[PDB]
Design an enzyme around this catalytic site. Structure first.
Site, PDB file in Angstrom:
ATOM      1  N   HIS A  19       0.834  -1.220   0.000  1.00 56.42           N
ATOM      2  CA  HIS A  19       0.000   0.000   0.000  1.00 56.42           C
ATOM      3  C   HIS A  19       0.863   1.262   0.000  1.00 56.42           C
ATOM      4  O   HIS A  19       1.870   1.321   0.677  1.00 56.42           O
ATOM      5  CB  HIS A  19      -0.973   0.032   1.195  1.00 56.42           C
ATOM      6  CG  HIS A  19      -1.679  -1.256   1.426  1.00 56.42           C
ATOM      7  ND1 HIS A  19      -1.732  -1.849   2.648  1.00 56.42           N
ATOM      8  CD2 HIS A  19      -2.329  -2.082   0.574  1.00 56.42           C
ATOM      9  CE1 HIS A  19      -2.382  -2.996   2.565  1.00 56.42           C
ATOM     10  NE2 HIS A  19      -2.771  -3.157   1.302  1.00 56.42           N
ATOM     11  N   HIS A  53      -8.868   2.468  -2.767  1.00 53.32           N
ATOM     12  CA  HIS A  53      -8.089   3.655  -2.366  1.00 53.32           C
ATOM     13  C   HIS A  53      -7.080   3.906  -3.489  1.00 53.32           C
ATOM     14  O   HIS A  53      -6.624   2.906  -4.060  1.00 53.32           O
ATOM     15  CB  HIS A  53      -7.352   3.364  -1.056  1.00 53.32           C
ATOM     16  CG  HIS A  53      -8.226   3.004   0.097  1.00 53.32           C
ATOM     17  ND1 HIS A  53      -7.883   1.990   1.005  1.00 53.32           N
ATOM     18  CD2 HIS A  53      -9.400   3.533   0.520  1.00 53.32           C
ATOM     19  CE1 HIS A  53      -8.816   1.931   1.944  1.00 53.32           C
ATOM     20  NE2 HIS A  53      -9.758   2.868   1.662  1.00 53.32           N
ATOM     21  N   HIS A  62       3.268  -5.263   4.177  1.00 61.19           N
ATOM     22  CA  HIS A  62       2.520  -5.722   5.367  1.00 61.19           C
ATOM     23  C   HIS A  62       2.859  -7.167   5.752  1.00 61.19           C
ATOM     24  O   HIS A  62       3.440  -7.913   4.963  1.00 61.19           O
ATOM     25  CB  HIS A  62       1.039  -5.540   5.127  1.00 61.19           C
ATOM     26  CG  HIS A  62       0.611  -4.136   5.355  1.00 61.19           C
ATOM     27  ND1 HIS A  62       0.299  -3.665   6.633  1.00 61.19           N
ATOM     28  CD2 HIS A  62       0.459  -3.091   4.506  1.00 61.19           C
ATOM     29  CE1 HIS A  62      -0.078  -2.406   6.534  1.00 61.19           C
ATOM     30  NE2 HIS A  62       0.018  -2.022   5.238  1.00 61.19           N
TER      31      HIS A  62
HETATM   32 ZN   LIG Z   1      -6.813   0.601   0.957  1.00 59.91          ZN
HETATM   33 ZN   LIG Z   2      -1.181  -0.797   4.728  1.00 60.82          ZN
END
Ligand SMILES: [Zn+2]
Ligand SMILES: [Zn+2]
Ligand SMILES: *[Se]c1ccccc1C(=O)NCc1ccc(Cl)cc1
Ligand SMILES: *[Se]c1ccccc1C(=O)NCc1ccc(Cl)cc1
Ligand SMILES: [Zn+2]
Lengths: 153, 153
Positions: free
Chosen positions: A46, A80, A120
């Site tokens: 991300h 997102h 992550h």
């Molecule tokens: Zn997201």
């Molecule tokens: Zn993240």
């Protein structure tokens, strides 16, 4: 014509170099590089909102979400801006990153420069995991390594 | 109303957090924070062109110089955009950074976001050192600590 880079480091053995390249402002961004010291399998990947490493990866804040959408996978309309899905590590703990994305940008409102790239602990479930957390964070868990996304030569 | 941050780290024990804040796009940027592990005296303090830390501080390239000018001090008209002069460390090796600059910006062409902040081995002579190197690097020497300049909350 636009190139940016990110050096991923954390508290553990997770470390990586990720390159971004965008030939035109309306065009896709090629994302490529290597991360090592991961466990075998999927790891959530991300762009987070803040380029702030003051207290490790936690100061990066939530997913970069300038358009106020819900969490998804890179290939959903509902995602997102920072949702780049998962990178996949082998038995050797190496993830070979090769991504093309049309939603992130290296200019304008979707620009990722000066934000944080995070890899992550777990798999991003891409918003289809069947709890509320799936449409926010995708249940990818803790931040193993991160860095500020910077302008390259 | 615009806030950015930079975490300085290096090969040595030099480490710092530096904050930048700009109330309006036409306005000055306040720069403040603390660096520790420095030798007593002046240390050159520059925004470098690339937010690239792939091979430590060296991949940051030269002084951020979008207007193709010669090196100077923060107070000169002839200066690189990235010329923030010197921070001063005490006997305790701490530099308390408190700068106001009207040439750097957190938006537009003079924007420092995604570039590298570097603190140097020696004093920046602010271009008045009387050699050609003074008009380029200010003879501040090696890079002790650096980080990519990031968007803050
Ligand atoms: Zn997201
Ligand atoms: Zn993240
Ligand atoms: Se990235 C970005 C987002 C929103 C507005 C402007 C910009 C931008 O143009 N940033 C400055 C810059 C300068 C040089 C390079 Cl190589 C990239 C970005
Ligand atoms: Se000013 C600048 C320099 C280099 C890359 C991008 C930008 C930029 O304008 N990004 C848009 C932006 C900047 C600050 C904040 Cl708080 C949000 C968005
Ligand atoms: Zn300079």
């Amino acid at each position: 014509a636009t190139k940016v880079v990110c050096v991923l480091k954390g508290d553990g053995p997770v470390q990586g170099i990720i390159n971004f390249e965008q030939k035109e402002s309306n065009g896709p961004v090629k994302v490529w590089g290597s991360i090592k010291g991961l466990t075998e399998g999927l790891h959530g990947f991300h762009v987070h909102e803040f380029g702030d490493n003051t207290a490790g990866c936690t100061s990066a804040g939530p997913h970069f979400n300038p358009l106020s959408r819900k969490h998804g996978g890179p290939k959903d309309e509902e995602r997102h801006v920072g949702d780049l899905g998962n990178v996949t590590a082998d038995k050797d703990g190496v993830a070979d990153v090769s991504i093309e994305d049309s939603v992130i940008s290296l200019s304008g409102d979707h620009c990722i420069i000066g934000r944080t790239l995070v890899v992550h602990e777990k798999a991003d479930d891409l918003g289809k995991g069947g709890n509320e957390e799936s449409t926010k964070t995708g249940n990818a868990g803790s931040r193993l390594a991160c860095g500020v996304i910077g302008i390259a030569q």
